[PDB]
Design a protein around this ligand. Structure first.
Ligand code: 1SY
Ligand code: 1SY
Ligand code: 1SY
Lengths: 327, 328, 326, 326, 326
């Protein structure tokens, strides 16, 4: 919500307010018309009971599938299989009895009609979920690709190199770097292009940044591999032909993974998905770094969207703009 | 499916067969009672029309919220918001226009008010939710998993980069530093997939008979603005009853370590059953990806194993050894 | 769409709006006349059910033929043979059961015989065909063209292979082999796409100004069992009013030559009015492919031109120079 | 039909035979039932007329889309648009005029119902085509990717290099080839794997394949490129570690294009379509080469299907067999 | 059409508009009278069925003669010899079944005997013939002329062989052998098409102004097993009012002379008025051939002239010079 105005905000409570207004208008309209309220009570109860019976029939129809994978998904219990499909059995049974008692007061004819309607819905696929209705059920439950990618990035990279970053910078400044050249600042800078176009060579896309030197590497043992290696680099920020400063630059590799996923046919990843996924990845990474012990005191996030008209946009300008708040 | 018996198979068509059986039973029952088919058909029509009019009210209630992020999710268009909330505006408009005519000619404002109350109560109280066994179906159908992203990341970042050059690395190590007195390192890199997500750091633990001998020549590349990214591997040997039996190139799968570590932090919202659910889906997706790649099963294939509950003296040395036997 | 005004735009949603207007008009007309609303519903249901009982007859007539290629197209599956003709055998079965129930209760054997005669006469006399403007939509929605394959072949075989290395050859030539007296050859290899499929072998003809200058260093590779496949290009000069104006790298598009030559052989079955529609579609597909390719328009330029019938003093040099200005 | 049993045969006339059987059964059933034939005639005529009116309404609905492409697709003419959407203005007009005259055998009510049903069919998508009908129309009208690819192959490669192969082989034998080395035979051998998996070099997939030497080049001018070059290769076939013979080997590059089209997502090309097009490309080449002047006397086609169980399939045996019955 | 106004334009759709007008007139006449709508339909159906039953007898009669050439025209297959006469045996069989069903249920053998007798009388007395204006359409739609074959043979044998090589001779002549004092011979090889079939052997006659100048270098090729086939041309001068005005190449068309000679022999059966319509058609066909050939009018020109009957001071020189103006 601060990285870029294009990043969305989490969903709120507009639906409940609209539902309340609709309920109030419906109640006022019912009061305006002349009728006793007992009919309203009876019809409302009957409608709710019919809805419950429809849900139960759908659950029984769906149970014909989940009983083929019992020994693989539900261990070996018939009681967990019915829990996955039919919510919570005890509440469902209580609602069953209440609905049957309130609906029995001809009658067997309507059960057949509900059966036909439910079977038609299952077969012909009349019922379904809108694109903005499955996008709000997988956001509260964390069923995203970018959620996993951001947590992987944090755990595997930033929880590892961030604590020991300043020691390497200090050693490079004293032991190796000469005093005549300018010192490299702290706070590793992460660039997050909200386009997933990550160039392999950073010298491209801007002639004003050139590769200067490297950093001492760090090693560790991870997942049965001895002496994994981590490395970084230092770049030069030319200002109108002369140097203006130095920094430590990186893109975000999961953006490259998203871009490469969007082109293979087997991935099943649309070209409209990997923009919302990039913005969601940026939001989640910012939230994770907000309250981590190795907080933004050691890294800064930069998000930019490439203008279509090329309005004299250069990466170096934005990088210097962000560098100028350090002091 | 063929990797381990515990891995589930994709869902097929069982709900449809149950639906046909229910449809046939309902049709026979309707035929078995005395009632004109005209009523049997017009009641069905009214039922369907009321369902559609309810869906529209739910959609408008959703739009009342979705119209707030207009400059952030839907660019600046009032029409993409409607397309996202209310399906397609032409088929939906036709269904509305046809629904009114049937429901207006066959106390008309009263039923609209009752539908409004029922829909508002559903939205507020929350009676209309999703069972955990259809959220799974839609997520698996549309590829909305954590393991999907993790598996594709693993492939694209590691295997697509190292599998082709493994032959040259092995050959150079063989003719340069490897002596014929010892067993030559076999081909076909081996990957272990513990369906517990418990990945120890060093392979010496958890089995005393796996000991680390030598490294391998490195590979270097440039990625995403980092100069000279390096990759390395290690070579392990298997000891049988005190005697060396062979030599392989062993590796765990790091995304499993990520899946395990994600389940301790409370900010992740990741349970302990979800970890087991995803660990058996990461393997399935990875095998499906490796089946149709040009760097096919001829260079490496997986080894899945589940730790016995009773701990009946499991020895992964035996599993890797028997895979070595079946290789030849 | 942006290359030439003559290139058509993709088909959209106009039939749906016309259908909505017709639906509204017929609904109002039905409301204006006097008839019970139940009769309209019953007749509409019966019509819809006959239109679905009349599709299984066509499906079975087709399945009488599709079962002769079982071992050659459908492995050995009776399930996959009936799945290619009769859509999906579950939704279709349910629709059949409901259709029978509705059409049997609302001389019942008489109507089946008449439906059989009507369907058989449709199949035999051929009254049920397709207009040229519905084939052109069903084969363009699903990518069933010749130009689609030709454009993807062009990309995969040529431009995915020479575009990335185009800088390392121009740069070497310009400094080692190009004399400082001559101007440097400009970047961005230029491709000419004549929407006539008339592709002359040598560029000297059809414009008496462009003249062959020299070649470029070539590159080699191994492909499909042949080793040392050689790619080479050439550099052309543009003489303005008798004097040089610049240099560039010029290419026609060979798939256009293939499209032209296909239209003269008799076994091709490819008409003279088709190799203009396909020529206009090939350019659109190339522009769409190069829009999102990593080896983007920073290395290549497209020039589409249609030769005037009246010879309105058209010269290729003017167009090439006009694009070189940018 | 000879290359491999898995290659399908072109579609025949089973639908017409099934239609005749259905018509005969319907006529016999109508004769068995008791009714005057006048009712049969009246109802059949009415059904056919209703079908014609439905087709006209669908055409008018579709015309609302093709009238915004008039200046691009159909030229400045208003008659070609109608001719494309409808099909035959004079015959259509006669059929409509004759059709509506038979209403004498609540009249606007039926027209309203027909319009409503047709609008529902257009909006709800109830008139789609099954894949085994789209396949039939595509194969009849030559709307395939493989058709274009095969014609491109023949026009661009074989029609250019086939005549000079004998001269190149003879010169290679006389100038360089020794008597101790086996003579390289004629008849360029083309392998057509019906799997689209084309390895970069033949040194893989069969250890018994060893690269021997090259062959003299060929040079020509095409599409403004000066001195395009062509090249081939010579391979040695080993039998149990000993030489058995030599030949001239090649894969089919359009198979590589077909394979690579199916990995990208923008191509919209499935994984069953790949196999179908691969098995159609071979049929089209066999048809083209059957009656060409540079006939099968200079090349041979070898189609092989990789066993699923991997029952020790060695491509060397496959080549050696055709070498034996050369 | 564009060469000379007397060349007829291709036949169009004019009978169909008259058919539409007649259909509308007869329909409104039926509407204006008093008669049941069903009786009109029944009588129309019976008339249509009788007209279809009256063709099977003719087909069987034609087959009774065509069966004697089964070993010479239809290999050995009865299916082909029955398909060559009775259309397609699938639509025809269904039509026959429907016709007999409608004719038998709606004195039955009396009509069969009368139809047979009428058909026998028609075939014997020859009452069913073909108008001269209908044969001229059926034999022009299907390319059943002599001019079509003559034009294609002329093109294939001469124009496809000398036209590309024409410039390489005239360019060399103009420098090596043509004196600078004499004007250079013009390009655009000219062919004269006299619409009279009168082709003199020598060009000196019929115009005392044109005189034979010199030769041209000849070319050699291999055709039809005879080698050293020599093609040579000639150059003529143009004398305007006693002084030289220009030089060009004049050519007649041998097929016109062949058409003229055909009209004289008795075994040819070629009438005097046929060699004029064929002469008209030949020019149109040849112009159509040259329109879309790759070797287009860039090397040739056509001149068509009709000799005036009154000798209105007509001279070939004026026409050829007016052509040389462009
Ligand atoms: N700029 C940069 N420099 C690094 O050294 C680095 N190391 C990791 N990363 C990114 O952080 C995350 C942590 O990787 P992890 O181990 O969890 O999964 C990794 C890991 O399973 C495997 N892998 C990648 N590199 C190696 C490697 N050197 N050795 C073994 N396995 C590797 O492939 C997965 C994806 O890697 P990347 O998709 O390129 O981006 C990674 C990843 O998103 C890095 N990013
Ligand atoms: N101007 C130009 N210079 C080139 O080097 C070149 N190479 C290819 N192309 C065009 O790009 C596409 C890729 O060719 P591909 O290999 O996929 O199919 C090719 C290939 O199967 C075969 N072929 C062509 N040249 C060779 C060749 N030297 N060796 C073997 N096969 C060849 O014939 C097919 C059609 O070739 P062209 O119909 O002339 O146009 C090609 C083609 O449209 C070129 N265009
Ligand atoms: N101006 C001119 N100079 C020529 O050399 C020439 N050669 C042919 N023609 C005309 O073009 C066409 C080519 O005829 P084709 O070869 O198909 O059959 C030829 C061929 O079968 C035979 N014939 C004619 N000349 C020769 C010849 N020198 N050698 C063998 N056969 C010949 O007789 C046929 C008709 O010849 P012409 O009836 O005199 O006019 C021809 C013809 O209309 C020529 N026209």
């Amino acid at each position: 919500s601060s990285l870029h105005p294009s990043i969305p905000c989490p969903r709120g409570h507009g639906a409940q307010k609209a539902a309340l207004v609709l309920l109030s208008a419906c109640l006022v309209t019912l009061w305006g018309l002349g009728e006793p309220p007992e009919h309203t009570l009876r019809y409302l109860v009957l409608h709710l009971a019919s809805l419950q019976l429809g849900l139960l029939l759908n659950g029984v129809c769906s149970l014909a599938e989940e009983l083929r994978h019992i020994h693989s998904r539900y261990r070996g219990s018939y009681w967990r299989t019915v829990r996955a499909c039919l919510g919570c059995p005890l509440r469902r049974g209580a609602l069953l009895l209440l609905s049957i008692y309130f609906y029995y007061s001809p009658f067997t004819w309507m059960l057949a009609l509900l059966g036909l309607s439910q079977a038609l819905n299952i077969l012909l696929g009349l019922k379904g979920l809108a694109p903005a209705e499955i996008s709000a059920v997988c956001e509260k439950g964390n069923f995203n690709v970018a959620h996993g990618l951001a947590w992987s990035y944090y755990i595997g990279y930033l929880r590892l190199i961030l604590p020991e970053l300043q020691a390497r910078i200090r050693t490079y400044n004293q032991h190796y770097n000469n005093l005549l050249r300018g010192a490299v600042s702290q706070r590793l800078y992460i660039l997050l292009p909200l386009d997933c176009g990550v160039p392999d060579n950073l010298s491209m896309a801007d002639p004003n940044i050139r590769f200067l030197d490297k950093l001492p590497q760090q090693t560790g043992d991870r997942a049965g591999i001895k002496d994994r290696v981590y490395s970084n680099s230092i770049y030069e920020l030319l200002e109108n032909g002369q140097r203006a400063g130095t920094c430590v630059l990186e893109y975000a590799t999961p953006l490259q993974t998203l871009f490469a996923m969007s082109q293979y046919s087997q991935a099943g990843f649309s070209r409209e998905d990997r923009l919302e996924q990039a913005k969601l990845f940026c939001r989640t990474l910012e939230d994770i770094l907000a309250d981590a012990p190795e907080s933004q005191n050691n890294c800064r996030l930069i998000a930019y969207q490439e203008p279509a008209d090329d309005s004299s946009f250069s990466l170096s300008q934005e990088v210097l703009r962000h560098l100028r708040q350090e002091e």
